[PDB]
Amino acid sequence: ADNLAEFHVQNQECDSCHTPDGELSNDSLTYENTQCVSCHGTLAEVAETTKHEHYNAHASHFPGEVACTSCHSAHEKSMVYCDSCHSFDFNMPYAKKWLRDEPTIAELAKDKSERQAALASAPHDTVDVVVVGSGGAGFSAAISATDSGAKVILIEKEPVIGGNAKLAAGGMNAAWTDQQKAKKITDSPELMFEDTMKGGQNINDPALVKVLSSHSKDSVDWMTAMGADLTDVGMMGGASVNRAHRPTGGAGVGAHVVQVLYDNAVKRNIDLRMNTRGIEVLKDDKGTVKGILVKGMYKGYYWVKADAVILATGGFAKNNERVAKLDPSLKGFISTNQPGAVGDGLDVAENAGGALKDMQYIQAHPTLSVKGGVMVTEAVRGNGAILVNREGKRFVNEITTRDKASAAILAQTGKSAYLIFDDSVRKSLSKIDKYIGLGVAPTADSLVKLGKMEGIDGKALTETVARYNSLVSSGKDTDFERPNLPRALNEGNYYAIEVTPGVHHTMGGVMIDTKAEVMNAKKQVIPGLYGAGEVTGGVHGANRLGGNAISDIITFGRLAGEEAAKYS
Ligand SMILES: Cc1cc2nc3c(=O)[nH]c(=O)nc-3n(C[C@H](O)[C@H](O)[C@H](O)COP(=O)(O)OP(=O)(O)OC[C@H]3O[C@@H](n4cnc5c(N)ncnc54)[C@H](O)[C@@H]3O)c2cc1C
Ligand code: HEC
Ligand code: HEC
Ligand code: HEC
Ligand code: HEC
Ligand SMILES: O=C([O-])[C@H](O)C=C([O-])O
Ligand code: NA
């Protein structure tokens, strides 16, 4: 057969998959997916049948309950979502090459011509608040608004939840938390503010950063009350003390936080709609929002009547064309992001009259795995790893800010470097075992063998580590002034990961005030319109600190949800 449906109808009726009337249930394809599960079992049950030693299409790091139709279409060939960042050896029936070519908001003007008819119709739903995007900002806002008495609809344009937030590794910054105190760490919201302002070249909006620093503990407390583990607290670049919180053992913060938000959303019966793209904010005759029209992938255009809309759509770091127009030094770089992170929500915001700011400030993560084409967490460095070049030498303070680290690596021979660490560092951060399972962390019982394996001068490598270990014991890095020297690299075997910068985060975005209200170029608030998370600009200035984006999206997501509800 040429497609999955044709396969099944060889021995099945249409209503094995469909509703009696044959209409698709909704854009999440709830009923239909329910039918696949009825015959094949849950995604976990399918997973038992498709294991490989180091990977499994049906048991991944994605949180939430991933719908079968995310990858398995019925009446046409479909794409494996994992192929958007990896190239695993898969044999999905009826597969086609991964290719993402979502139309822009501007191109969707080719649907006047569908859109006019929708807007002429009754609104499909009438609620209080509509939140766009199921990343951390969006779930936080949806939950926050719901607890504040508002009826919400949460929409996600992708087939799966979580956006980039589900990918987060290194942690969530906050000061001065109960969790830090339990780990004997001394910190303050003032210190966090100062690290943050300096890290961003004092470009950041000080009122927004004040909100980030002062609400950070509350945000950790809120997530914890909802069931999250934020008890491990690590170091990230440009911070005066350890303040990046994540699950026990040093597991990734991202999938965990989104899973917790998802669970809490489902607990409150929040209306979550997948494959549903926010297209244009609707405003009444006095310019306040009155709703939003959306495009369901399976059921087409419709609008939702509401007093408020919260845009929580993430950044545009996956869109290299737009990035390179803003910062040509990043043209052609690989990105760390999910395939939908291309900035269409910003278009939505601008079309609704919101102004943008700081857009030229785009952050490259200094360590994308060259071999895997995926982000390798900064916590690897925070927990003690060093960087060496092909000459087997250190060349930079590995916990400096990302602008400086990226430039340093790009200035080394071959425009890449190697993370080097031992088993003590490996055991201190369980997320590192994920890089090993991905096959991107070759290992050996001596630095000479490792260097010969990876094309690093082996003798130089050895002396570099011996010398670095001596600075660790002396307590002072006189070579590159790295301010925190947490571990000597001397336990067990040695690992190398080849790394180079990848485009990661867009610090610019829609202009918001401290209540997360979106503003126009005259600095006037657009009543009913809110923005939270990486879609906004002004929080992180010219360079964002590792750990500060998850802090941002919880704090500003929650704040937007409560402001939205109050606005009502
Ligand atoms: C690999 C990786 C690791 C990171 N780790 C860390 C970390 O450890 N600590 C840290 O502080 N930061 C980290 N960052 C950054 C942080 O995760 C992101 O800044 C965060 O994802 C921004 O969250 P958000 O809620 O604003 O957006 P996202 O989580 O990206 O969610 C936005 C969602 O909106 C959807 N969307 C967009 N437009 C539309 C639309 N028009 N209609 C409907 N849906 C829409 C998107 O598909 C997406 O699912 C990491 C980023 C990546 C990529
Ligand atoms: C389950 C394995 C399926 C069987 C067998 C059939 N259909 Fe289906 N259909 C299914 C899904 C999940 C969807 C969504 C799109 C996709 O291809 O994945 C569909 C959709 C259609 C549609 C489109 C309806 C619309 O766009 O509004 C129609 C017209 C349709 N299917 C009809 C249909 C008939 C007549 C079938 C029996 C011969 C049949 N489908 C089987 C899943 C499955
Ligand atoms: C029960 C009534 C089923 C429903 C509803 C769906 N599937 Fe199914 N599927 C079923 C059978 C009995 C078989 C044959 C193998 C077996 O388990 O006995 C299949 C086969 C598939 C396959 C493989 C097709 C191929 O070319 O080999 C896949 C990938 C599969 N089915 C997917 C799938 C999805 C995603 C469903 C819903 C959209 C779905 N199936 C419904 C039985 C049933
Ligand atoms: C993408 C992220 C997927 C989602 C979501 C689901 N499936 Fe899948 N499926 C996917 C791949 C890449 C493959 C191949 C596995 C491999 O290791 O090569 C498959 C395969 C199937 C099959 C065939 C299994 C077999 O008997 O060999 C079935 C029956 C199947 N998938 C079912 C299925 C169902 C019902 C889903 C939802 C619960 C589902 N898959 C999710 C990728 C993806
Ligand atoms: C890009 C946005 C990604 C997509 C889409 C998928 N994964 Fe991923 N994967 C991602 C990263 C950044 C990493 C590095 C390690 C980490 O936890 O951050 C990985 C790694 C894996 C691995 C290795 C570790 C492990 O969990 O076993 C596997 C086997 C893996 N990813 C599988 C996987 C599957 C099956 C996906 C589709 C559902 C999937 N990934 C998509 C980034 C990205
Ligand atoms: O390196 C990390 O884990 C990460 O990528 C952290 C931030 O904030 O973006
Ligand atoms: Na931004």
Coordinates of N, CA, C and O and ligand atoms in Angstrom, one line a residue, residues 167-171 173 236 363 365 367 375-379 381 402 435 504-505 544-550, ligand 6:
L167 N 13.3 20.9 26.1 CA 14.6 20.6 25.7 C 15.6 21.1 26.8 O 16.8 20.7 26.6
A168 N 15.2 21.9 27.7 CA 16.1 22.6 28.7 C 16.9 21.6 29.5 O 16.4 20.5 29.9
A169 N 18.2 21.9 29.8 CA 19.0 21.0 30.5 C 19.5 21.5 31.8 O 19.2 21.0 32.9
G170 N 20.4 22.5 31.7 CA 21.2 23.1 32.8 C 20.5 23.6 34.0 O 21.1 23.5 35.1
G171 N 19.3 24.1 33.9 CA 18.5 24.5 35.0 C 17.8 25.8 34.9 O 17.8 26.5 33.9
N173 N 17.4 29.5 37.0 CA 18.0 30.3 38.0 C 17.0 30.9 39.0 O 15.9 31.3 38.7
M236 N 26.3 28.0 36.2 CA 26.3 28.2 34.8 C 27.2 29.4 34.5 O 27.6 30.1 35.4
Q363 N 21.5 35.0 20.6 CA 22.5 34.3 21.4 C 22.9 32.9 20.7 O 22.1 32.1 20.3
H365 N 24.6 29.4 21.5 CA 25.1 28.5 22.5 C 26.5 28.1 22.1 O 26.7 27.8 21.0
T367 N 28.3 25.6 22.9 CA 28.6 24.2 22.7 C 27.5 23.3 22.1 O 27.0 22.5 22.9
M375 N 22.4 20.5 21.3 CA 23.0 21.3 22.3 C 23.6 20.4 23.4 O 23.0 19.4 23.8
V376 N 24.9 20.7 23.8 CA 25.4 20.0 25.0 C 25.5 21.0 26.2 O 26.1 22.0 26.1
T377 N 24.8 20.7 27.3 CA 24.6 21.7 28.3 C 25.9 22.3 28.9 O 27.0 21.7 29.1
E378 N 25.7 23.6 29.1 CA 26.7 24.4 29.8 C 27.0 23.9 31.2 O 28.0 24.1 31.8
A379 N 26.0 23.1 31.8 CA 26.2 22.5 33.1 C 27.4 21.5 33.0 O 28.0 21.2 34.1
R381 N 30.2 22.2 31.7 CA 31.3 23.1 32.2 C 31.1 23.5 33.6 O 32.1 23.5 34.4
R402 N 28.3 33.7 27.2 CA 28.2 32.9 26.0 C 28.8 33.6 24.8 O 29.2 33.0 23.8
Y435 N 24.4 12.2 26.7 CA 25.4 12.5 25.6 C 26.1 11.2 25.2 O 26.4 10.9 24.1
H504 N 20.8 29.8 19.3 CA 20.1 29.1 20.5 C 18.9 29.9 21.0 O 17.9 29.3 21.3
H505 N 19.0 31.2 21.1 CA 18.0 32.0 21.8 C 17.9 33.4 21.2 O 18.9 34.1 21.0
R544 N 22.1 36.7 27.2 CA 21.4 36.0 28.2 C 22.2 35.1 29.0 O 23.0 34.3 28.4
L545 N 22.0 35.0 30.4 CA 22.8 34.1 31.2 C 22.1 32.7 31.1 O 20.9 32.6 31.1
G546 N 23.0 31.7 31.1 CA 22.4 30.3 31.1 C 21.5 30.2 32.4 O 21.9 30.6 33.4
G547 N 20.3 29.6 32.3 CA 19.5 29.4 33.4 C 18.4 30.5 33.6 O 17.5 30.4 34.3
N548 N 18.6 31.6 32.8 CA 17.7 32.7 33.1 C 16.4 32.6 32.2 O 15.5 33.4 32.4
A549 N 16.4 31.8 31.2 CA 15.2 31.7 30.3 C 14.1 30.9 30.9 O 13.0 31.2 30.9
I550 N 14.5 29.8 31.5 CA 13.4 29.0 32.2 C 12.9 29.8 33.4 O 11.7 29.8 33.7
Ligands
LIG6 O1 23.4 24.9 28.6 C1 22.3 24.7 29.0 O2 21.8 23.8 29.5 C2 21.3 25.8 28.4 O3 21.3 25.9 27.0 C3 21.0 26.8 29.3 C4 20.4 27.9 28.9 O4 19.9 28.9 29.7 O5 20.1 28.2 27.5

